[PDB]
Every structure is written in C-alpha cells, then in structure tokens.
Design a protein around this nucleic acid. Structure first.
Ligand code: CA
Ligand code: NA
Ligand code: NA
Length: 320
DNA sequence: GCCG
DNA sequence: CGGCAGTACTG
DNA sequence: CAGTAC
C-alpha cells in the first residue's frame, strides 16, 4: 500500500521473469511483492527489508537501489521480447512455451498470430475473446452468471447446490472469471449431469464457446442475453459431495493461499488437494508422493483448517 | 527469486 | 542443495 | 508425455 513505489518496479521484473519461462524466480518476486504490499511501513533500511519473510539479501539490495537512485537498472535491461511475450501469453490456452515459439517464429502482434500462427482450439477461442478475457466483470454481472447456471442445473434437480467461488466468493468488487461449483448432497445425483446441463445452456444461447469439457471440470465462454454484454470466462466444476469442502476451498482461492495451505499440509505429513485432505501421505526426499494416505473427513471448510492446526479464515481473508 |  | 501445490485436462 | 490452466 504505502510501498507502491517499490512494488511497481519489482512487479515489472516479476512479469518479465514469468513470461520468459523462469517460473521459480518469478515466484520469489511474487511473494516479495505480496510481502511488501502487506508490510506496515515504507521500507527505509536494508536491515528492515531483510527481516521481512519473503525478502532475502538480493531482494533487499533491489529495494535499496529503488530508494537511493529512484530506478532499477535491470528495468533498463529487460529484453525487448517481454512486451510481445505478454501479449501472446494473455491468449487463453497460450503460455510461456507457446509465446516464446511465436516470438521465435518472428511474430510480434496478435495480427501475426491471427494470420500466420498455428493455434489450438483453445488458443483460437481465447484470441477471439482477447479483449473480453482481459476485463474483470462487476460482481453484479457474476451473480447473473451464477444464477443462469444454477437455474439450468436446478431445473433437472432442485436439490442441487451451486456456489460461485474464486474472487467472487472472496468478496471482491470485480471478478476475473466465474467459478461455478456444482454438487448434490446425496453423493450420486451429480452423475452424468454435464451433458444435460451444458446442452440446456446452449439451447438458450448462453454458452458461446467451449474450452475444456472434462469429466469433473468444464471451462468455457458465456455471454448474458441482451446488449452491452461482454464474453466472460465461465467454469463449472461438478464434484461428489464427499469432496465438496476441499473443492470449495481450493476454487475460492486465492492461488497463493492454496499454495501456502498445501505447503503447510505437507509439513504436517498431510496432503491437501481439491479432492481431499489426506493424512499420513508418504513421501521420499524429493517431496514426492509414494503413499496415498487416508482421506480425512472434511465436511466444512473449517474442518480443513482445524485438521491443519489453523484458525478458520473467511473467504475475504484468503488473499494471502 | 525465497526458504529450510 | 533443491523444493517451491496438486490436479484436471488436452492434444 | 509437455504444456496450460484450474
Ligand atoms: Ca477469480
Ligand atoms: Na529472512
Ligand atoms: Na493466458
């Protein structure tokens, strides 16, 4: 908040390292960004920055240069390919490997991608709604989208439960996308409902394009009826009710929150996933699962916190 | 990039 | 030194 | 499987 003059410089280097394939170095920048945004005072000393968790010796040296000289010399040495890679990676379905290949092939704009680049089915859809997918909708519009899916699902089974997660359930004023989670408390009526639910949403012209049509999760594009409506990202994950709490917790977010929770689960001999919070998960020296462990009963989100020795945090308190 |  | 979340999904 | 996104 009060250190935005330091976080904005590191944020450019974080996107540059991310789009260039250095995902782990970009992870250290992202956690240093979140630590600076939540710190209590504008940093003014080298020892003050090193004492912060998530900021080591190198990150504190970069904080020192921003205060003393007002610039980061590495920002003057960012590869000219980075802005072009950010343009390509924003295409949904196109990541760092695809963006780097397109820049290697000589492409510099989305016009080069439209006319000359080899596109997958998902990349062509993400490009078709390039401007629409970069916009965060008001949470009012996200409510209309969740009610559209919920009415179609409950039309065949009124006992179905539909909860919108992501940034929406965290209480954010705007939402990047809509994460609709569907389940049924009887543990069985959720079977084979994807074919009937998505067909009902297509008959009314609500679904415009389809990105992923899997057994459990569905990713796609939708647009509310009427004028002035943008194409918004829509997700529909259907889970068994025995896995509803872990799925609700993962899909509510945020992404970093899940990564700190699942890391803490590993430090306690447990394994947290969008399916279940297993305990006694066996592993080797590489932190790789060799024993499946046993699913712990988690009927609510509070049970996942309790089994992890954590006090419960509301969805609005899960941004870090 | 950070951390144990 | 070496992990850094786990998994569904798609070709 | 690599790549991508959840
Ligand atoms: Ca979101
Ligand atoms: Na430290
Ligand atoms: Na993308």
């Amino acid at each position: 908040n009060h250190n935005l003059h330091i976080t904005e410089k590191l944020e450019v280097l974080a996107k540059a390292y991310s789009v260039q394939g250095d995902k782990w170095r970009a992870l250290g920048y992202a956690k240093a960004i979140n630590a600076l945004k939540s710190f209590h005072k504008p940093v003014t000393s080298y020892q003050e920055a090193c004492s912060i968790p998530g900021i080591g010796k190198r990150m504190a040296e970069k904080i020192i240069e921003i205060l003393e000289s007002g610039h980061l010399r590495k920002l003057d040495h960012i590869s000219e390919s980075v802005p072009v890679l950010e343009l390509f990676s924003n295409i949904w379905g196109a990541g760092t490997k695809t963006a780097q290949m397109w820049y290697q092939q000589g492409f510099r704009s989305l016009e080069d991608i439209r006319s000359q680049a080899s596109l997958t089915t998902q990349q062509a859809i993400g490009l078709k709604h390039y401007s629409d997918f970069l916009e965060r909708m008001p949470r009012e519009e996200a409510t209309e989208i969740e009610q559209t899916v919920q009415k179609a699902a409950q039309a065949f089974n009124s006992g179905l439960l539909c909860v919108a997660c992501g940034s929406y359930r965290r209480g954010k004023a705007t939402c990047g996308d809509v994460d609709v989670l569907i389940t049924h408390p009887d543990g069985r009526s959720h079977r084979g409902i994807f074919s009937r639910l998505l067909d009902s949403l297509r008959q009314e012209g609500f679904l415009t394009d389809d990105l992923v049509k899997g057994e459990t999760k569905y990713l796609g594009v939708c647009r509310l009826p009427g004028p002035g409506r943008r194409h918004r990202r829509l997700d529909i994950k259907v889970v068994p009710y025995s896995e509803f709490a872990c799925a609700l917790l993962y899909f509510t977010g945020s992404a970093h929150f899940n990564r700190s929770m699942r890391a803490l689960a590993k430090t306690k001999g447990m394994s947290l996933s969008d399916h279940a919070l297993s305990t006694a998960v066996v592993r080797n020296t590489h932190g790789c699962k060799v024993g499946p462990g046993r699913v712990l009963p988690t009927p609510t989100e509070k049970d996942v916190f309790r089994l992890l020795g954590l006090p419960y945090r509301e969805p609005a308190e899960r941004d870090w």
